[model samples]
Target: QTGYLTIGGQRYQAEINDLENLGEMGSGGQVWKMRFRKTGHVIAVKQMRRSGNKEENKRILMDLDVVLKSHDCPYIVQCFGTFITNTDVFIAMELMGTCAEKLKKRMQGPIPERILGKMTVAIVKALYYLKEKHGVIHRDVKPSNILLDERGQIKLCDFGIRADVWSLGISLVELATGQFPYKNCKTDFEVLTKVLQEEPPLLPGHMGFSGDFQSFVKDCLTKDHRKRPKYNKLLEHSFIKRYETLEVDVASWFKDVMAKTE
Candidate 1:
């Protein structure tokens, strides 16, 4: 079936094809990788069922509102448009190659420092932009929410944002080590207790990561939220600045990783 969507005040006609299922979202929504028929451009269309549950519907609308309004941000996923059927809401977005969580599972080891630096810079910029421009806090910054495209572009997806800084720190450690740092926590309560009672996780020094990167993660994982470095402070850190301008072949690296996985 064909549908019309209005994106940025312009309407475009598109159709959902029987393509690959990207994965299931936390909200019980499913993402399908589809294409725009006329333009032949590929996009990820998130299909969500409208339910009687108020909280579920609210979450869906909240996500749609955030992505629709934040169209101009380079680091945030680009939502082309959204349409609703009798029982489902479909949101078309930019198709990223893969998420960090999935990529980590396929890799043999840690994500290299240079590529990780770039990913960090992109996510920080996204969080910074959300706060400075939209007054929104992305409470859900994690490796799963951070996406990378084939062109080496990294963008943040999923509209959950603080406590955000801590999540970012945890995510960084996960991406760096290919494992969630809070090991042995069997339950949510255990994880929360550990977070509150013990020191925050850090990038292992024995891994030979730079002191700058290590310090940056430390700043993010500060036990006291008040003492944690804000987005502006994070952007100014030496670790971020070091790779901000450097031209690294993230595309080539991503291709190699995917190739090996296949």
Candidate 2:
């Protein structure tokens, strides 16, 4: 498919209809479970408005850049094409059935260590690819940004770098504990202050997971961005390395989690 998205007419060749509303892709937009009426293909369409605010405009453009630049990369979601109207922009991409954030809540307990390990490797590999090859920073890495399709492949989405490292630290805690570590914070300011001075949340010592996995969370949550390790170095962590040769049945676990949501 061509990287450029043209506005109006039969140029795009497909008609769109909303199958279900999935909610926002980021601050400036919303996503839909859609069908390309011409074929059996179903896709997720992220429809975002062209905003009057300058920053909002730029945010929309950056997302478009991800599809244009790195859609071919395995760990990232694939963009099929784009559609544009005067006031709105439509992005048609592969439809993923669930994301880590949704599964975190549905599971009701810590996700298994082997599953976490493989998922982490997929996330970091994608982050590393975006940073090293495309000169982009994920700037907004979190569990919600890590996704899984019906086929069980893990894919990373949205923007960050060391900012990404920090987000993953918080996200991992959510996966391990079954909720966001700072959910107790009633306000955004409280969460911000806690993140700056307080230590990131730990894996429940009660969970009895291995030391390397526990240690990986600690190293990632370091408050000083300068000292935060990149994905290349973090890939060497024992927790991630252990999964390198092991075939974890990710699809089985993912299906079970999806069943809970359904």
Q: Write the per-residue lDDT of candidate 1 for residues 65-166, one digit (tens) a residue.
A: 777778778899987777667887788887789888778877967988889999988888888888888888877687778899778999998855147788
Residue 111 alpha-carbon offset, candidate 1, angstroms: 0.7
Candidate 2: where is the Cα deviation over 4 Å? Answer: 1-28, 50-55
Per-residue lDDT tens digits for candidate 2, residues 14-119, read: 4333234445544435777765544445677877777657787677777678666885588888777776767767787777877887787788777888888888
lDDT of 1: 0.79
Best by lDDT: 1
CA lDDT for candidate 2: 0.75
Predictions in order: lDDT:
0.79, 0.75
Candidate 1: list runs displaced more than 4 Å.
1-11, 15-28
Candidate 1 pairs with clashing backbones: 138-161, 139-160, 139-161, 140-160, 140-161
> How far does residue 174 in candidate 1 sit from its true spot (Å)?
1.6
Best model per TM-score: 1
